């Protein structure tokens, strides 16, 4: 006879919306039935009532710690349909900010994970780095979280004048900030007690279940869309892909921790190779014209009017 | 053209550190074990000396 | 090996000076690690609202 407990919704590990109905025979989980939809909003129904430009912010708020990668997936879909090309500088900016976004997301995931197991301090240390990067978000887009910066055709605005230096200055010390978290976590035997051989997933079942990302690379399969289907400027930059072998919580932790380093490498490369030119596609039938044209030129004013109406 | 755009320096930035930097520190484990044995031995020496003298004080009392 | 350790004086972070520097180097797990605090005269200065490049920018 199974004993049924409602894990979540009001539970810090549950993240507030995970009603996880478990059935226990003593200590051991026999069946698990996650219930979702406490955060079903009808994003997909609402997008059909929105222009593409208007529908872009729906994606910021899907994975609300990886905003710019969401904007990037939607932008790539719409540009592929539109048969247009993002300028080089725009591609490089989208790569830099995709990796700043990856760093932010991994800080949130790793530190929230360690807080769930009980390690409360990396939460705060990594949250200061999160603050530093959200300064860069706010400087390029005007919002800390929901930037709406990456748009079909490129990015909404060019970088402010003093941003590359500040990113580089932060990059000179992020390495140490990582080493300190690793000092607390990588070799701690309690951490390895909580993570080694927990949640083991085989390669074949990983493929069968539809898992991707670290959840798949932890099981030994070297698959990475950035290397396999080179999108944006992921072919102009040099980085490695970490692959686990045991497919347990510890391998995935190691993978994430090394993806931190690879992201730092990519950010530095884009800081060194940022080219000049436009940031959005230069056809005013897709992206709006600069305001100095919109206020002097008839064609530009018409295109601006139509694009925003 | 491109005037006033944020651009990297002509020579580029100095390379940042990104590989793992967790240098090993500490004496060898056997040195720590030897220190522990020394401290424990000296402590036992003093403790047993004190116990014996306390016994002689008990004799006097 | 590129990406290896760089010394703490090439990192834009406050750190320590004087006798306290020597104390820090003696007592640090890894002496080349920065403290995380950005250098006030260097970091995010001039402020974004007072960049001189704003008055020269032209659409690319």
């Amino acid at each position: 006879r199974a004993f049924t407990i409602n894990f979540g919704p009001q539970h810090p590990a549950a993240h507030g919306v995970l009603r996880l109905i478990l059935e226990l025979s003593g200590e051991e989980i026999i069946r698990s039935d996650p219930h979702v939809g406490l955060l079903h909003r009808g994003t997909e129904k609402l997008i059909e009532y929105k222009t593409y430009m208007q529908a872009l912010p729906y994606f910021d708020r899907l994975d609300y710690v990886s905003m710019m990668t969401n904007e990037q997936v939607f932008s790539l879909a719409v540009e592929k349909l539109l048969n247009v090309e993002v300028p080089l500088r725009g591609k490089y900016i989208r790569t830099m900010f995709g990796e700043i976004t990856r760093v932010l997301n991994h800080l949130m995931s790793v530190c929230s994970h360690a807080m769930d197991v009980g390690a409360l301090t990396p939460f705060l240390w990594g949250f200061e780095e999160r603050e530093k990067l959200m300064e860069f978000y706010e400087r390029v887009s005007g919002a800390r979280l929901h930037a709406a910066y990456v748009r079909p055709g490129g990015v909404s605005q060019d970088l402010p004048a003093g941003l590359l230096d500040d990113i580089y200055m932060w990059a000179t010390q992020f390495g140490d900030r990582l080493d300190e978290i690793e000092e607390l976590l990588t070799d701690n035997r309690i951490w390895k007690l909580r993570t080694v051989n927990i949640g083991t997933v085989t390669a074949q079942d990983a493929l069968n279940l539809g898992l991707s990302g670290p959840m798949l690379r932890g099981s030994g399969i070297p698959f990475d869309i950035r290397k396999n289907a080179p999108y944006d400027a992921y072919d102009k930059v040099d980085f490695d892909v970490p692959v686990g072998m045991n497919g347990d919580c510890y391998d995935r932790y190691l993978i994430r921790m090394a993806e931190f380093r690879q992201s730092l490498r990519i950010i530095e490369q884009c800081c060194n190779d940022m080219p000049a030119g436009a940031v959005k596609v230069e056809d005013f039938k897709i992206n709006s014209p600069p305001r100095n044209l919109m206020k002097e030129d008839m064609e530009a004013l018409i295109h601006h009017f139509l694009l925003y109406t | 053209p491109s005037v006033g755009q944020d651009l990297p320096p002509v020579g580029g930035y100095e390379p940042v550190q990104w590989r793992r930097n967790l240098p090993a520190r500490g004496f060898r484990p056997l040195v720590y074990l030897a220190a522990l044995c020394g401290i424990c031995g000296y402590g036992f020496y003093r403790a047993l000396g004190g116990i014996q003298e306390r016994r002689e004080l008990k004799r006097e009392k | 090996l590129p990406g290896g350790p760089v010394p703490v004086f090439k990192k834009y972070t406050v750190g320590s000076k004087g006798i306290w520097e020597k104390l820090r180097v003696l007592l640090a797990i890894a002496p080349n690690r920065s403290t995380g605090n950005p250098i006030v005269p260097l970091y995010r200065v001039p402020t974004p609202g007072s960049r001189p490049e704003a008055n020269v920018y032209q659409d690319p």
Binding site: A276 | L7, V10 | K10, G15, I39
Partner: peptide
């Protein structure tokens, strides 16, 4: 050899292009 004399990046010579060429 210390942070008080770390070189000011903000005054380094930046790269400058005159015309950007992006083929159609």
């Amino acid at each position: 050899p210390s942070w008080e004399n770390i070189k000011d990046i903000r005054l380094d010579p930046k790269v400058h292009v005159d015309e950007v060429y992006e083929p159609i």
